[PDB]
Nucleic acid binder design. Structure first.
Ligand SMILES: *OCCCN1/C(=C/C=C/C=C/C2=[N+](CCCO)c3ccccc3C2(C)C)C(C)(C)c2ccccc21
Ligand SMILES: [Mg+2]
Ligand SMILES: [Mg+2]
Ligand SMILES: [Mg+2]
Ligand SMILES: [Mg+2]
Length: 760
DNA sequence: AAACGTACGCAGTTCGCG
DNA sequence: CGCGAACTGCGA
């Protein structure tokens, strides 16, 4: 099993390191024969001798062309003749590529910015994470001493916990009487003890939750202050911080640092992504959270540290269990993309596509297009195109609703209509498909590059969807459901890649052709179900719609829906397939992107509602949730109205706990870059002026008090709320929080109650 | 050096124009 | 003051 690859430099020459696990043993395979290269398209063959003499410099090293070789390749399927330029070191290429491209006889250069380690795995046909080798894993977490206004890692680390199959333990330098706690005397001794534990256990995988941003950076800073060599790497190196765009990540040489946060963030849909919320969503069990202030109080007074040590232990325990569950999913994606799990688990879906395209292009001797330069990138950013079809929803509380959607609308269109940059407006093409409205022609004579790849990806998803249905175990079934959804989004991300400005295989004509065909197909299914089966489509968005037969009972709606599915699937061509998603006994559709339905098990699913979003207080979400249940489950409009009257009366009489009035909103930039100052920005600016560290990602938790001025003038951070001096704004939480969250819902059901609120 | 990206859509807060 | 634009943030 190949775990990872990188390169080092020995005496000026690059040495590829292949990190492997074979027969239960970690091994490093070295390759000193791999030469970096890129391609040059020349105006005339005779200029190659002048191109060979181009030189450059980098860090005191004179860069020259080592060897050139003429090769026959394809570019978007058409034969091309380019020169392969070899170099000694991969760092030579960035230093010299601009001067080579600037030569008057050089038309363009290609494949000049592919990282040396990824170039090696592609050109050698090597796939990570293959085989039956069992990987050893170890999760860890830290607890720190925090005080408001201090620099990052100004206070010491208090606890370091870890967990594997042998259990979970905590290392700390204060006496805590728990059997899983190991006590040392100083923070330095605890760090060095943790370093020892990792050395003796020698795990292949280090699991964290947000270790890319907090744990490793905190450990790093503390190790510099204490003079500790944090030699976590299998080659004796320290963890290395890396940067991708605006995100940071930490690698440990010879191992796989598996940070679960970017994995869970795009695998599960949750309102918040705390470790406690993630563990509860996956395993169905709650996890207690102990906050930084209680940790500091327990450590500094010495009272109540067992609770802190239990929280620290459970942090490591649930991180190991989560990592164990999600490793197989990310291992498969690593095999599918063809890049190490460290990169695949963190990289954007654009690179998940492009890294695979680069590998398949190499297998087919297809020259890769370049990432755009500054002018082309800006031009792609400005241009846009039409997207999915969204229908204005029908008002009212409807009954006996079916939701029908396409299995994989955009990948199906790409394959069926052969939508690819190498098939667009192809000369001398015999048979082609013309996209509606946008009019682009896609050749059908030969399968396009990208269409020829999506079919296998879709089948991999159907394989997981089959194993999911055949698995009775609820946890294993849920994990497979997470897995098949990741593959579905990855495949559909091929359409978005077509419109992504940084894409090598960018194709705006391809992107708007896919959406145009998508709009045509959903409008076709909508027209057919209404005309031929007497259905009424209530709401539709991009690849699915809600429909019913007005006045019919549940059995008739169900029976006629399957009949229509047989009818429409016979008509729909290629890979397009409409599916029976589910039946719902009641539902309403507030606006576009806003709806709520309930199945025959009384389970309420919603879309785009306030119960999920940030910026809404608990009293508003709770009241909305109770109104949803009263309308959907009980069908009782008078009960829903009664609930609103009771909640607004409780607010007017100050009987609602102020904890239910906290509003959480995230700061997304430096406070200087805000052009308008709203409630959460005004609070953040007031906090920062007092020494509180405000950074992008900081969540502001405020409450609106009775006072004067704008809402921002009345809002204060909830951590400073004192019920002895502060009285909250009851009129605000009624008129701006509770009422907007229920009034649109009740109106969408056809009930515009004048005096919903208590008194006024 | 490497780059978290597709269109469509709602809605709260703020504040000058007419 | 009604209205709407600008800003802001998030949600197939
Ligand atoms: O390499 C040839 C081009 C040189 N060049 C520039 C290079 C910038 C490199 C960025 C390095 C970097 N890393 C390491 C990359 C892997 O993450 C890193 C890791 C972690 C945190 C931060 C960082 C950074 C910040 C920056 C610059 C210097 C930009 C430049 C300017 C003009 C011409 C050539 C180059
Ligand atoms: Mg790497
Ligand atoms: Mg664009
Ligand atoms: Mg069909
Ligand atoms: Mg006027």
């Amino acid at each position: 099993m190949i775990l990872d690859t990188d390169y080092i430099t020995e005496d000026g020459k690059p040495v590829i390191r292949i990190f492997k696990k074979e027969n239960g043993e970690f091994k490093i395979e070295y390759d000193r024969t791999f030469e970096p290269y890129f391609y040059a398209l020349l105006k005339d063959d005779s200029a190659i001798e002048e191109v060979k003499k181009i030189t450059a410099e980098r860090h005191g090293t004179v860069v020259t062309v080592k060897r050139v070789e003429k090769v026959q390749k394809k570019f978007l399927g058409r034969p091309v003749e380019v020169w392969k330029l070899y170099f000694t070191h991969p760092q030579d290429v960035p230093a010299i590529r601009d001067r080579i491209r600037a030569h008057p006889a050089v038309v363009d250069i290609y494949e000049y910015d592919i990282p040396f380690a990824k170039r090696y795995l592609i050109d050698k046909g090597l796939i990570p994470m293959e085989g039956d080798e069992e990987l050893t894993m170890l999760a860890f977490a830290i607890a720190t001493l925090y005080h408001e206004g201090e620099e990052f890692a100004e206070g010491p680390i208090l606890m370091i916990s870890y967990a594997d199959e042998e259990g979970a333990r905590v290392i700390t330098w204060k006496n805590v009487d728990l059997p899983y706690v190991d006590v040392v005397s100083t923070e330095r001794e605890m760090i060095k003890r943790f370093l020892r534990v990792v050395k003796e256990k020698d795990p292949d995988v280090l699991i964290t939750y947000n270790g890319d941003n907090f744990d490793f950076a905190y450990l790093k800073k503390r190790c510099e202050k204490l003079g500790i060599n944090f030699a976590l790497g299998r080659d004796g190196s320290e963890p290395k911080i890396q940067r991708m765009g605006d995100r940071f990540a930490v690698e440990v040489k010879g191992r796989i640092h598996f940070d679960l946060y970017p994995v869970i963030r795009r695998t599960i849909n949750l309102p918040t992504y705390t470790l406690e919320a993630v563990y509860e969503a996956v395993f169905g069990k709650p996890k207690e959270k102990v906050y930084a202030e209680e940790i500091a109080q327990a450590w500094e007074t010495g009272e109540g540290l067992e609770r802190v040590a239990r929280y620290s232990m459970e942090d490591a325990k649930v991180t190991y269990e989560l990592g164990k569950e999600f490793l197989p999913m990310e291992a498969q994606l690593s095999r599918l993309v063809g890049q190490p799990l460290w990169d695949v688990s963190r990289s954007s879906t654009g690179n998940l596509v492009e890294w695979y395209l680069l590998r398949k292009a190499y297998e087919r001797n297809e020259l890769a297009p370049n990432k755009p330069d500054e002018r082309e990138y800006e031009r792609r950013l400005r241009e846009s195109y039409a997207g999915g079809y969204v229908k204005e929803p029908e008002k009212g509380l409807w009954e006996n609703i079916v939701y029908l959607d396409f299995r994989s609308l955009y990948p199906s269109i790409i394959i069926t209509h052969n939508v690819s940059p190498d098939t667009l407006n192809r000369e001398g093409c015999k048979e082609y498909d013309v996209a509606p409205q946008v009019g682009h022609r896609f050749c059908k004579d030969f399968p396009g590059f990208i269409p020829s790849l999506l079919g296998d990806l879709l089948e991999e998803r159907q394989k997981i969807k089959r194993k999911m249905k055949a698995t009775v175990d609820p946890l294993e079934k849920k994990l497979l459901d997470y897995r098949q959804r990741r593959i579905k989004i990855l495949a559909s991300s091929y359409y978005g890649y077509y419109g992504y400005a940084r894409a090598r295989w960018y194709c705006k004509e391809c992107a708007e052709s896919v959406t145009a065909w998508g709009r045509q197909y959903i409008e076709t299914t909508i027209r057919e179900i209404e005309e031929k089966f007497g259905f009424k489509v209530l709401y539709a968005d991009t690849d699915g719609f809600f429909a019913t037969i007005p006045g019919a009972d549940a059995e008739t709606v169900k029976k006629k829906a399957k009949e229509f599915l047989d009818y429409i699937n016979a008509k729909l061509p290629g890979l397009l397939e409409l599916e029976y998603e589910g039946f719902y006994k009641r539902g309403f559709f507030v606006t576009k992107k806003k709806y709520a339905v309930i199945d025959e098990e009384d389970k309420i699913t919603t879309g785009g509602l306030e119960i999920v979003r940030r910026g809404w207080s608990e009293i508003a979400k709770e009241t909305q949730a109770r109104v949803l249940e009263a309308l959907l489950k009980d069908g009782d409009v008078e009960k829903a109205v009664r609930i609103v009257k009771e909640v607004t009366e409780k607010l007017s009489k100050y009987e609602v706990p102020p904890e239910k009035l906290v509003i959480h909103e995230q700061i997304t930039r430096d406070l200087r870059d805000y052009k308008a100052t709203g409630p959460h920005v005004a609070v953040a600016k007031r906090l920062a002026a007092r020494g509180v560290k405000i950074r992008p990602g900081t969540v502001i938790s405020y409450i609106v008090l009775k006072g004067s001025g704008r809402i921002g003038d009345r809002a204060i951070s909830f951590d400073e709320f004192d019920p002895a001096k502060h009285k909250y704004d009851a009129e605000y939480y009624i008129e701006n929080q509770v009422l907007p969250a229920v009034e649109r819902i009740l109106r969408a059901c056809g009930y515009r109650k004048e005096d919903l609120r208590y008194q006024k």
